[PDB]
Amino acid sequence: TTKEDVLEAVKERDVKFIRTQFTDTLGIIKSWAIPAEQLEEAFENGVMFDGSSIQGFTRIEESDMKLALDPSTFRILPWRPATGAVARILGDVYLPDGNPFKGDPRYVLKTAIKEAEKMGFSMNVGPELEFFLFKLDANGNPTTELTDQGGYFDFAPLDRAQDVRRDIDYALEHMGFQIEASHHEVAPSQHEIDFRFGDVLCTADNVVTFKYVVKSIAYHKGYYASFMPKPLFGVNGSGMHSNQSLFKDGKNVFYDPDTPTKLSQDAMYYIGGLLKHIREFTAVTNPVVNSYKRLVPGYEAPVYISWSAQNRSSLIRIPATRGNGTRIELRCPDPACNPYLAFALMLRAGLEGIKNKIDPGEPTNVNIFHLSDKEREERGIRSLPADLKEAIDEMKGSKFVKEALGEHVFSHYLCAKEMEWDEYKAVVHPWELSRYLSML
Amino acid sequence: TTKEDVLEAVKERDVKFIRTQFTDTLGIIKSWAIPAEQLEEAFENGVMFDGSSIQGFTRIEESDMKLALDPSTFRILPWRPATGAVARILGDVYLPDGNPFKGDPRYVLKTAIKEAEKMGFSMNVGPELEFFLFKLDANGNPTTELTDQGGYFDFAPLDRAQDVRRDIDYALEHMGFQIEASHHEVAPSQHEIDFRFGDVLCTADNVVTFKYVVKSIAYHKGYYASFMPKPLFGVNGSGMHSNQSLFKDGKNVFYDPDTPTKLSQDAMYYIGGLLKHIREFTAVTNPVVNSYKRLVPGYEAPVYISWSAQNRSSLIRIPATRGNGTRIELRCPDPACNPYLAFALMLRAGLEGIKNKIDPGEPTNVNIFHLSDKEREERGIRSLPADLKEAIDEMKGSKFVKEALGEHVFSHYLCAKEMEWDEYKAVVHPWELSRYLSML
Amino acid sequence: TTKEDVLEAVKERDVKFIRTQFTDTLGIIKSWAIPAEQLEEAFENGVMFDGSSIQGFTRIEESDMKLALDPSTFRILPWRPATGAVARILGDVYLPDGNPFKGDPRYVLKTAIKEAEKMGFSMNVGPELEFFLFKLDANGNPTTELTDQGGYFDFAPLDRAQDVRRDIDYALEHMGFQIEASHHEVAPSQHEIDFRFGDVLCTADNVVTFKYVVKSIAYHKGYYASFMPKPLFGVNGSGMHSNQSLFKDGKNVFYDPDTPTKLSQDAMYYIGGLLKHIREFTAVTNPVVNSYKRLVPGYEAPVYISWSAQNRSSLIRIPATRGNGTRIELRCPDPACNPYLAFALMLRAGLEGIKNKIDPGEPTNVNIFHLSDKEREERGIRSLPADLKEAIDEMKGSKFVKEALGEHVFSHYLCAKEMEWDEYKAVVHPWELSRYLSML
Numbered sequence A, B, C: 001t002t003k004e005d006v007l008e009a010v011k012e013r014d015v016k017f018i019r020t021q022f023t024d025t026l027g028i029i030k031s032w033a034i035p036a037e038q039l040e041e042a043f044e045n046g047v048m049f050d051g052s053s054i055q056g057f058t059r060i061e062e063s064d065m066k067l068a069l070d071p072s073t074f075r076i077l078p079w080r081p082a083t084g085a086v087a088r089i090l091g092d093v094y095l096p097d098g099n100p101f102k103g104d105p106r107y108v109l110k111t112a113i114k115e116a117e118k119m120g121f122s123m124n125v126g127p128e129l130e131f132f133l134f135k136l137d138a139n140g141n142p143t144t145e146l147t148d149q150g151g152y153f154d155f156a157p158l159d160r161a162q163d164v165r166r167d168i169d170y171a172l173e174h175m176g177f178q179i180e181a182s183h184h185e186v187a188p189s190q191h192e193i194d195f196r197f198g199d200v201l202c203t204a205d206n207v208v209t210f211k212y213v214v215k216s217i218a219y220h221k222g223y224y225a226s227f228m229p230k231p232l233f234g235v236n237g238s239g240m241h242s243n244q245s246l247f248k249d250g251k252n253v254f255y256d257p258d259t260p261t262k263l264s265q266d267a268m269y270y271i272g273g274l275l276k277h278i279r280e281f282t283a284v285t286n287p288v289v290n291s292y293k294r295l296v297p298g299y300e301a302p303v304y305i306s307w308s309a310q311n312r313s314s315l316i317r318i319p320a321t322r323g324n325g326t327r328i329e330l331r332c333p334d335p336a337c338n339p340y341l342a343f344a345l346m347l348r349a350g351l352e353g354i355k356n357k358i359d360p361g362e363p364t365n366v367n368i369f370h371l372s373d374k375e376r377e378e379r380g381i382r383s384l385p386a387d388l389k390e391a392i393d394e395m396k397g398s399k400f401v402k403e404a405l406g407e408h409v410f411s412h413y414l415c416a417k418e419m420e421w422d423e424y425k426a427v428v429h430p431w432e433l434s435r436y437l438s439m440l
């Protein structure tokens, strides 16, 4: 798809508004509309916006930013009226002088893809995204009231969101997605939708799309879709399971029928590199305070650093599917993260495993939550950052994460997350009053 | 049907989503949707799911499970829209490598069918599960409020669920059910729908279907369908009378016009066999704590172990119908049980009766509830397990049930029921506060 | 005062009930009443109780505990009726075989006092206890609603605890306290009563007596006295400043009339030891999760390890008073701490500072909250443990704190605090739903 095909699709399908979109450094999608009559000149001039009103983008005395449109991302939004049909287009962020903005999260992922190509590979991540369907209130703003008390794979009337989950599938299919499965998840009113994997760029655009498509579809039905990692205590949390495989010559490099476990050496080294660096960018994968209330044992979320086949208690699970389905599933990432930065760091953590032949230890093919602390330390197992501050500390000292993100993204990400933590740590919570007020 | 017929029916009838379904060990239906485009892939590769999130199924270190589809069990759900028509397919659970997971209740029932064939028989059970129709609250959750005060065979306006029952029959007919009759039952808001008998596999699939079809239609019509055996006190409860029969060369083996009572010797031995073993697997037919509030005298629910013709106070009634309709009605089970396990155990017990020529005693052709304890003890009549713990104890000590179920199903059924009961024996109920708390 | 004097006072002042009391490991006062008629024999037989129902005392297999009475602690409670006058007696916890149970906080403080005696010193401590006065709801339960909006030294009607503080001072004077000054504190509805210092044992007893006297007096007037460090956010917290000096031959050892700053060398060494060991037992001085929400900058609660004269932003302030009155004010602790453990650890740290001439650096006669991180790092200033887990970690690796507390107190304190933190670390607070749940 070129700029000329987008204009033809705008005329043929009667598009009136194009929503130019980009993602800010914290993974939030920023969008604004232009008339179709402007598209042409936009394509040769770029749209202009204010970078000082975007998180971690640019300062107020140098605030003008340009957005250059990517014609390949032209999609048509199906939940908006077909008369004045509304399309969307994602773009890259440029400085007004003309150079690409190094602070663009979508540029970091492109830079990582460059190194992947230099080594002759291409990441083919495809994520599992889970969300919660809560009820709205009179005004129409989010709540945490459950829409049902169902469980895993539960049928109606325990599962009350199947009519609201057909339309998500339909919208995704109209937006170029390839749905694979759709089901209720372990937590009450928690659902998960899986779509086919693809290139890292397309998959990250799909992640941000999927998120806002799901939220918009839920809103127009009376509910609210929340991709918050741990909205409820004592039940499962939402994860963003990142299954990834390297592809060379259009073949799965991670597959090897001759070796035991049908896992090639490049997959072993990729795992080794992924484990050597996960501690450093857990801040990126789990970027909010809530994402660390999900990393507690007993809810199928990782707490320690390990890897084993078929083990949904471990960090790097290897599903049983071999052949063109041989991938590694990283289970830490949360749907609240920035997919561009997260995928970039995953990509070049594996590429540090291949260039340095980083052998991981023996797999821990056992439940790790049912181990003593002595058992865990004797086996060499280490734990993930306990809270967001510990992850921030592990991230600041990193040279790998700074080299991957770059100075601007590194510094601005850290500055936002430190402010978040400083706001969090001073707060007095109702738990503290209900625990200490009467006893002291 | 076959694979190709399913695809032809998906194209011809315009099916968009296929709901792949199975049954967990405790009898709950677990389903999830895949696009029709995925169907051809799911027939050659199976659909993978998490076994660790299914009750009594598999552990979290080897949690991957495959599910292979059964083309014959392909139906089209009528209460879902006809534009994006939704079908369902039941499957058999497999270990991810190649094996037919033995913890699957469907596999247990198939194993019992194998022994039936080895003896040259085929069970033809047809059940008559009852249910209650309660009202939903403002949110739409189940309540125990009555939808009518009617009784047995009551007409309107005492019977207020004629439209609900008519639409349930309509949907069941579209799902391939041969409806026999439909009526109000003794308890208020309690209804019963009867469909033709068939092969035990088909009728177990039909039991699970019937249940979720009824529940979904009731939900969409405003009410809640409850298969709880004893939802209300003082009124009779819901049971799943299993009318069992053996067929050889397409002829009812239990029929014998020359013998008195028109019951063959094989029927006699089957009665003796499943009378000697019921105490052992009452924890399967009656699997929940509420299941034994139903087994109290005075409500046409069995309390003792006996058989007699047309006696609705006895454990094994023999209806008056002879000829092709000659069967034996085991009245103990609830609709809360797992039909795959329950029918398997009944079939195995009957076949064990036939092998060892187990003659039952004389038929107790009296109201057993009216007999005294001395009368029952002198007549040799035994009682069923009084509560869930007694049934668990009678079941774990048995070798017949362990052989029939297998180690995995046996142990994971015990464990589940023991944890269920241990959570119930420690509860302080408002009955104890209404009785005590003022006298003490 | 001895047993004979206690009996004489019981007869003379018409006492019927004696509240035998002791402090548990976590600082909570546990008491029970015995009739005066039993006193005469309790003195020679102790009073037996159940140690398994006391936090960190003993196990259920060996739960029988004895408590011996201390006649010197006999006080008469003035807020209870004078007809059947009620007295109190603090006890020492023994073991039924007969030995000074080492898990007793009183025993730990007594061991620290013995350690001091060998060096010729006697520790004098004057606590600085602040509290909040909140309203009680309809049922008489604690709330967090303010009883006034006054500030520091505010007069009525801005200060609305005139009568409450007047009667608290009266009760404390009746219980042998020498009241120094009562005033309104910085936070709204925060109050401070100061009493004269004394021997560390006597003032450790006074600390628990003060808290329960204040709580009872406030309760009888319709309020709730809260000794919670940080019950409200954005407002000063309650701290228990430990003013401490060393006396040798009835003279203040910390005073030196001919020396700059008029502080003796022993005072300098005591400061050095306190500073060098503070990080290790911050889990004792600040033992609850809420005590580290008080240790935030901008509220006159210390955040960093420093010392300077008249600096209320410093960890160790040295007030301007000299002569009899020269002390060091450790501002770290909060009222929620166990005074017996806290004073014991401070005394041991100071004595360890004196034994090895631990010179502290130059004082930081500067506001430290206003310094940058770079400035603090350049000056070598270390920060206090950021949260309860950090303090727990710093305490576990300590050999000094284990030496002072002992194996039993050490281990049981660690266990209680780790359980507390693990309960707190997994909670989802409303702050997380107000911040996220719309952003995500």
Ligand SMILES: Nc1ncnc2c1ncn2[C@@H]1O[C@H](COP(=O)(O)OP(=O)(O)O)[C@@H](O)[C@H]1O
Residues within 6 Å of the ligand: A124, A125, A126, A127, A128, A180, A181, A194, A195, A196, A197, A241, A243, A244, A245, A252, A319, A324, A325, A326, A327, A329, B048, B049, B050
């Ligand atoms: N070779 C591959 N490389 C990367 N991702 C893949 C590959 N094969 C499958 N996937 C993706 O893995 C995801 C697995 O999702 P799903 O099977 O629903 O959950 P789980 O695998 O945790 O049971 C799918 O979204 C799919 O697109």
Ligand SMILES: Nc1ncnc2c1ncn2[C@@H]1O[C@H](COP(=O)(O)OP(=O)(O)O)[C@@H](O)[C@H]1O
Residues within 6 Å of the ligand: B124, B125, B126, B127, B128, B180, B181, B194, B195, B196, B197, B241, B243, B244, B245, B252, B319, B324, B325, B326, B327, B329
């Ligand atoms: N030969 C047979 N074998 C097994 N089941 C049968 C046979 N004949 C009839 N049935 C079943 O017995 C059930 C009888 O139900 P119904 O007559 O409504 O209640 P009841 O028999 O208790 O009065 C029907 O569902 C029918 O399918």
Ligand SMILES: Nc1ncnc2c1ncn2[C@@H]1O[C@H](COP(=O)(O)OP(=O)(O)O)[C@@H](O)[C@H]1O
Residues within 6 Å of the ligand: C124, C125, C126, C127, C128, C180, C194, C195, C196, C197, C241, C243, C244, C245, C252, C319, C324, C325, C326, C327
């Ligand atoms: N020599 C001393 N040793 C120990 N404590 C002392 C000494 N002199 C006074 N104190 C105590 O110091 C405390 C000072 O309280 P306060 O007047 O509020 O001081 P500040 O306002 O500086 O905190 C009093 O409780 C008093 O008993």
Ligand SMILES: C[S@](=O)(CC[C@H](N)C(=O)O)=NP(=O)(O)O
Residues within 6 Å of the ligand: A128, A130, A185, A186, A192, A236, A237, A238, A239, A240, A241, A294, A299, A300, A301, A302, A312, A331, B050, B053
């Ligand atoms: C059953 S679950 O196993 C739930 C995982 C949980 N929500 C989490 O990873 O945080 N994971 P998956 O969808 O990969 O099967």
Ligand SMILES: C[S@](=O)(CC[C@H](N)C(=O)O)=NP(=O)(O)O
Residues within 6 Å of the ligand: B128, B130, B186, B192, B236, B237, B238, B239, B241, B294, B299, B300, B301, B312, B331
């Ligand atoms: C009158 S009843 O006859 C008794 C049903 C009752 N609810 C029971 O628990 O078995 N059932 P049916 O007529 O189907 O034999």
Ligand SMILES: C[S@](=O)(CC[C@H](N)C(=O)O)=NP(=O)(O)O
Residues within 6 Å of the ligand: C128, C130, C152, C185, C186, C192, C236, C237, C238, C239, C240, C241, C294, C299, C300, C301, C312, C331
């Ligand atoms: C005005 S205050 O300065 C109170 C400080 C605060 N309550 C705290 O130490 O946490 N200090 P002090 O009581 O010693 O005079």
Ligand SMILES: [Mg+2]
Residues within 6 Å of the ligand: A128, A192, A194
């Ligand atoms: Mg999934």
Ligand SMILES: [Mg+2]
Residues within 6 Å of the ligand: A128, A130, A185, A192
């Ligand atoms: Mg999932």
Ligand SMILES: [Mg+2]
Residues within 6 Å of the ligand: A128, A241, A329
């Ligand atoms: Mg997964």
Ligand SMILES: [Mg+2]
Residues within 6 Å of the ligand: B128, B192, B194
């Ligand atoms: Mg019937």
Ligand SMILES: [Mg+2]
Residues within 6 Å of the ligand: B128, B130, B185, B192
């Ligand atoms: Mg019936």
Ligand SMILES: [Mg+2]
Residues within 6 Å of the ligand: B128, B241, B329
């Ligand atoms: Mg019947």
Ligand SMILES: [Mg+2]
Residues within 6 Å of the ligand: C128, C192, C194
């Ligand atoms: Mg003061």
Ligand SMILES: [Mg+2]
Residues within 6 Å of the ligand: C128, C130, C185, C192
């Ligand atoms: Mg003060």
Ligand SMILES: [Mg+2]
Residues within 6 Å of the ligand: C128, C241, C329
């Ligand atoms: Mg002070």
